[PDB]
Amino acid sequence: PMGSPYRDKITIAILQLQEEGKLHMMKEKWWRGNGCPEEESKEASALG
Amino acid sequence: DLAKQTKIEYGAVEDGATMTFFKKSKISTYDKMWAFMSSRRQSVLVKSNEEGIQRVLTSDYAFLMESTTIEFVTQRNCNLTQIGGLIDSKGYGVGTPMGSPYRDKITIAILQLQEEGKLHMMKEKWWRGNGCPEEESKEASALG
Amino acid sequence: PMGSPYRDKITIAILQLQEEGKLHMMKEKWWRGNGCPEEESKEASALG
Amino acid sequence: LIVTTILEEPYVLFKKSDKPLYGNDRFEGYCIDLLRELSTILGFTYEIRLVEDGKYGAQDDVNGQWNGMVRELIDHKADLAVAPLAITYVREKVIDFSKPFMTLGISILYRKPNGTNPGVFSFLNPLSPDIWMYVLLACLGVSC
Amino acid sequence: LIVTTILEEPYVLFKKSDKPLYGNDRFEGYCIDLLRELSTILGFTYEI
Amino acid sequence: ADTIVAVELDTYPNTDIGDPSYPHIGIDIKSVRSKKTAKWNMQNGKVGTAHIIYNSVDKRLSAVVSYPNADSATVSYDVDLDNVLPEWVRVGLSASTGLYKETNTILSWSFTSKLKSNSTHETNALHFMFNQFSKDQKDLILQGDATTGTDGNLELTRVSSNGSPQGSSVGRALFYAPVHIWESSAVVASFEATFTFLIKSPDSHPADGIAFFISNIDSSIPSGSTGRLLGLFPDAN
Amino acid sequence: ADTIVAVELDTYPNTDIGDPSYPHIGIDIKSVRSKKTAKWNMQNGKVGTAHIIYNSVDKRLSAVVSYPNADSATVSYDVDLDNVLPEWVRVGLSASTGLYKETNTILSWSFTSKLKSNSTHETNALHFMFNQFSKDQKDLILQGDATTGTDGNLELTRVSSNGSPQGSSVGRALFYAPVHIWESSAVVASFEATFTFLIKSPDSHPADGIAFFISNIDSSIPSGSTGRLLGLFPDAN
Ligand SMILES: *[C@@H]1O[C@H](CO)[C@@H](O[C@@H]2O[C@H](CO)[C@@H](O[C@@H]3O[C@H](CO[C@H]4O[C@H](CO)[C@@H](O)[C@H](O)[C@@H]4O[C@@H]4O[C@H](CO)[C@@H](O)[C@H](O)[C@H]4NC(C)=O)[C@@H](O)[C@H](O[C@H]4O[C@H](CO)[C@@H](O)[C@H](O)[C@@H]4O[C@@H]4O[C@H](CO)[C@@H](O)[C@H](O)[C@H]4NC(C)=O)[C@@H]3O)[C@H](O)[C@H]2NC(C)=O)[C@H](O)[C@H]1NC(C)=O
Ligand SMILES: *[C@@H]1O[C@H](CO)[C@@H](O[C@@H]2O[C@H](CO)[C@@H](O[C@@H]3O[C@H](CO[C@H]4O[C@H](CO)[C@@H](O)[C@H](O)[C@@H]4O[C@@H]4O[C@H](CO)[C@@H](O[C@@H]5O[C@H](CO)[C@H](O)[C@H](O)[C@H]5O)[C@H](O)[C@H]4NC(C)=O)[C@@H](O)[C@H](O[C@H]4O[C@H](CO)[C@@H](O)[C@H](O)[C@@H]4O)[C@@H]3O)[C@H](O)[C@H]2NC(C)=O)[C@H](O)[C@H]1NC(C)=O
Ligand SMILES: CCCCCCCC/C=C/CCCCCCCC(=O)O[C@@H](COC(=O)CCCCCCCCCCCCCCC)COP(=O)([O-])OCC[N+](C)(C)C
Ligand SMILES: CCCCCCCC/C=C/CCCCCCCC(=O)O[C@@H](COC(=O)CCCCCCCCCCCCCCC)COP(=O)([O-])OCC[N+](C)(C)C
Ligand SMILES: CC(C)CCC[C@@H](C)[C@H]1CC[C@H]2[C@@H]3CC=C4C[C@@H](O)CC[C@]4(C)[C@H]3CC[C@]12C
Ligand SMILES: N[C@@H](CCC(=O)O)C(=O)O
Ligand SMILES: [Ca+2]
Ligand SMILES: [Ca+2]
Ligand SMILES: [Zn+2]
Ligand SMILES: [Zn+2]
């Protein structure tokens, strides 16, 4: 809210998590899903 | 990769936030770099970023630094590049003293400059890409 | 030594570390060195 | 106000002019042109001053004190820190940052390896230079 | 809790630096990192 | 940067930055771009006998370097240390190596100043005669990667892999006590030295040179001085 | 308590702590209770000439003081400097007063040690000759309330109250650099001194004596020394 005693406590706390890397660990925990098998997965090409 | 070869010297800038990240890190790869860099602490830790540029141009040195200054170097020197991805994410804050009335008024005035593109029109001006061979664009390689 | 009050304290303690995986984390911290570039690194073969 | 800063290309750098540059005239770059626009919005008067010790800011962890622009802010010598002063965990505890005007990332500056071109006698490469003689001595031999 | 150890890489080895170190911090390797973890869980001083 | 004046016994030819085409003696005034140079024979691991005077009644800064059965390297440049070097200074030795190998072993070092209360009013001194550099010599502020002891020697290198002198290493040997100079009580202090050294060949075409500086009372190894900058200068101009 | 060996030129009888009924030159081995004393004449504002040696060819720790047209007080006590005083020292001057005032102006000071690198082979030295104490003499670690400058003088009292030097004042004048002694390369370290003082008559029974010590490398004013403790002792033992 408009002036809170919990902004600066979290502002320091978010900076701790990306220093430890846990904001990157939780990033790779949810956004990483199936690899979405790429366009370079030809494996066969009968010329048509 | 870069933590596991002592063939290439690598350091950072002294009194800076790059080596402060490695000084306080506890993950195995980045502490291994700080286990490397703490030994030859004078040999690899250069004084400013400009000496961090120049000792890559001369020696077999790989300099750890920020992305937004690599964006200005590699658009000027077309033999240097950004090896690897972003290690972490940080930002440039307009620093104010502890408990200031100008913290919030600049917090307004940065967001106002960002929604109307002023913080992008200035970055396009002062980084001035200049033309540079970007890549061979690794693909099929039609014989000239 | 031949009968110690510190065997069983470590016997439980070693089992904690491989459950957490730190015996594997310290394994990959020291035995992993340079990749020793493999025999499948041909890159050129002029026929002689 | 008194705005501390530091030379770092292309953020803050001296302006190229022959005249006896006065006050704020000698400075040009990104971060002062940021502060040229922050001064129009908030309606104040900045007055650029360098950092004295020439560092950014770091904890000397012997006396537990600070250097650089961070020490310039805690002692209230200069009111802003419009600079490439990054946002880290150990700096936010002692001074107050604004929101970022730029997003960073730590990475590696290193030389591009030189891609020596496959010069115009490239098609002789798939056989060794003694085998091309052995074929030539064959068609000079078998024909005889 | 006197710990008798014998120098073999990469298990224990001397920590190289500019300034010479003195005591338990002279040593590094796998078995030093193991004995730190045993001293963290159980809780005991150790003299190499 | 610290204002620093040295007498470089440089061994790497740098026609880039003003070192001549040969291994030389050189005399530096606040710049690695020297003032005078002279040819020096540069024999292998042998003894040393170098010497520096600066008598302000003659205002030359002469020097010689002598092996046995060799010749003197007279590099006397006319410079006045009135205005080019601070009031209270800190003398000492500087050595370096980089991308090559060479030995930087000092075996003895001395000094003698005599500075003018009112010229015949019993001039001061700071004479010392370190022939026997010991293990825990605590009147030296040896910086860099410089060591001492293990013999009567001053080993200004990371050394002792059969002495193979471990390239890209910088060593300094700052003496502890200051010396009044500027002029101010005028500057007739004929400060002598003796700079016995042993530059042994590692069979490597050995080249990065030893120095003898006169720095400010506060110094360090500035921002990388391993190499052609030769242990003390920050900048190559 | 720091280990310290001094030569008290005590200008005040201290009968409670072993100083004799007469003002005296003394000698100290970790004790304000002196080993050996001798009668000193203690003239008014005049000058100076003191001299202290210890040659281990004779192992006598001697000290002499002479005004011009006065005698000499040989107070030589054989003491073994092997074990009574550490390897590395920090020599200097010490002076104090208390409840009686006196001027303790030193106006020149020297020192000359010579310790056996290998007895013939070019022993070490630390010769200096401070005849010209400056206003900003930055090779003195002058402690306490010692002053300097404003003339060629070393004023080891809070002075310039018309030369009535503000009683219960104390000021030490430690030299900046350490000296090798203990034995280790045995103990012929014939340290010399020359200690030209000035003790002005305050018309107030001039009193509390000047010293010349050889202390530990770390030192300060011990626990308050304005008086009988003479500037350098914590206790009266
Ligand atoms: C019995 O009743 C006592 C009541 O007097 C009582 O009090 C006192 O107790 C303290 C211990 O707690 C102890 O004090 C000593 O007194 C010494 C002599 O008195 C001097 O000085 C005192 C100042 O302390 C003055 O108050 C006196 O009047 C007298 O000095 C006069 O001073 C003026 C100055 O303007 C002169 O003009 C006068 O001419 C002079 N009159 C005289 C000399 O008759 C005192 O000196 C002791 O001080 C010592 O340390 C000080 C620190 O540097 C220096 O002053 C100096 O070093 C002193 O050393 C003594 O100095 C004497 C010269 O004054 C010399 O004999 C020697 O150099 C040295 N003495 C010795 C023996 O070595 C100290 O303060 C006394 O016990 C006592 N004071 C007395 C008697 O004055 C007692 O506790 C009661 N009980 C008992 C059991 O006695
Ligand atoms: C992109 O394109 C550039 C093209 O330039 C390429 O980058 C180049 O990489 C080169 C790496 O070699 C670098 O080379 C310069 O070499 C010359 C040649 O002289 C010697 O210089 C050094 C030693 O003095 C060595 O690094 C050189 O390799 C060469 O010496 C040989 O070194 C052998 C190993 O030490 C040695 O074997 C033993 O050595 C000892 C000691 O020397 C004894 O001799 C012993 O008996 C030997 O057994 C060889 O004998 C030795 N041979 C000779 C003839 O000496 C040189 O000019 C330079 O180094 C000198 O100059 C610098 C200038 O400051 C000075 O500081 C040094 O101390 C040294 O005196 C270089 O090393 C090129 O500079 C560099 N180019 C650029 C622009 O950076 C890249 O490879 C390309 N990228 C790709 C392909 O991806
Ligand atoms: C199946 C048919 C067999 C025929 C038998 C006869 C074969 C006899 C051949 C014998 C040897 C010939 C090749 C030499 C070896 C090549 C490797 C090399 O290092 O050379 C190099 C130097 O460039 C040269 O010098 C190449 C030689 C030029 C002559 C080629 C004549 C064509 C063959 C005659 C045919 C005529 C018709 C035949 C009869 C009707 C080439 O490589 P590069 O590209 O320069 O790399 C450097 C580039 N860079 C500097 C930028 C980095
Ligand atoms: C019966 C049996 C026979 C009897 C024995 C007889 C004795 C014969 C024994 C021979 C022994 C072998 C000696 C030669 C070795 C060469 C290999 C080498 O490394 O050098 C180089 C060869 O590159 C060339 O330059 C080749 C010459 C041009 C090619 C054209 C020749 C044929 C043309 C068409 C033929 C028409 C066919 C018509 C058919 C009817 C490669 O290295 P490089 O980097 O390029 O070096 C550059 C050198 N240069 C600077 C000078 C250029
Ligand atoms: C018909 C004639 C003219 C053809 C050319 C000459 C022939 C006979 C000669 C020239 C060089 C010779 C080769 C030289 C080297 C080797 C490697 C050895 O481990 C096996 C034999 C082998 C593989 C030889 C086989 C025969 C060879 C190819
Ligand atoms: N410019 C950074 C330091 C250098 C870096 O972290 O790359 C800062 O001021 O925090
Ligand atoms: Ca050189
Ligand atoms: Ca006394
Ligand atoms: Zn040179
Ligand atoms: Zn006494």
Author numbering:
A (entry chain B), C (entry chain D): 769 to 816
B (entry chain C): 673 to 816
D (entry chain C): 433 to 576
E (entry chain D): 433 to 480
F (entry chain F), G (entry chain E): 1 to 237
Copy out sentences from the published article reporting this entry, exactly as the authors wrote them:
Kainate receptors, a subclass of ionotropic glutamate receptors, are tetrameric ligand-gated ion channels that mediate excitatory neurotransmission. Each KAR subunit has a multi-domain organization, including the amino-terminal domain (ATD), involved in receptor assembly and trafficking, the ligand-binding domain (LBD) that binds agonists, competitive antagonists and positive allosteric modulators (PAMs), the transmembrane domain (TMD), which forms an ion-conducting channel, and the carboxy-terminal domain, which determines surface expression, synaptic localization and interactions with intracellular proteins. Here we present cryo-electron microscopy structures of the kainate receptor GluK2 in the presence of the agonist glutamate and the positive allosteric modulators lectin concanavalin A and BPAM344. Concanavalin A and BPAM344 inhibit kainate receptor desensitization and prolong activation by acting as a spacer between the amino-terminal and ligand-binding domains and a stabilizer of the ligand-binding domain dimer interface, respectively.
The ConA-bound group of GluK2 particles includes two subgroups, with one or two ConA dimers bound. The most compositionally complex GluK2–Glu–ConA–BPAM (GluK2Glu–ConA–BPAM) structure has an overall two-fold rotational symmetry and two bound ConA dimers. The core of GluK2Glu–ConA–BPAM is a GluK2 homotetramer with the ATD and LBD layers assembled as dimers-of-dimers where A–B and C–D dimers of the ATD, as well as the A–D and B–C dimers of the LBD, are arranged symmetrically around the overall two-fold symmetry axis, with domain swapping between layers. A distinct feature of GluK2Glu–ConA–BPAM compared to GluK2BPAM is a marked separation of the ATD and LBD layers, emphasized by an increase from 59 to 75 Å in the distance between their centres of mass (COMs) and lack of the ATD–LBD interfaces in the A and C subunits that are present in GluK2BPAM. Instead, the ATD and LBD in the A and C subunits are connected through ConA dimers acting as extension spacers. One protomer in the ConA dimer contacts the ATD, whereas the second interacts with the LBD. The ATD–ConA contact is mediated by carbohydrates attached to N378, the glycosylation site conserved among GluK1–3 subunits. The type I ConA–LBD contact is mediated by carbohydrates attached to N546, the glycosylation site conserved among GluK1–3 subunits, and the type II contact appears to also involve carbohydrates attached to N751, the glycosylation site conserved over all GluK subunits. In addition, the role of ConA as a spacer between the ATD and LBD layers appears to be an elimination of ATD–LBD interfaces in subunits A and C that might restrain the activation-associated expansion of the LBD tetramer.
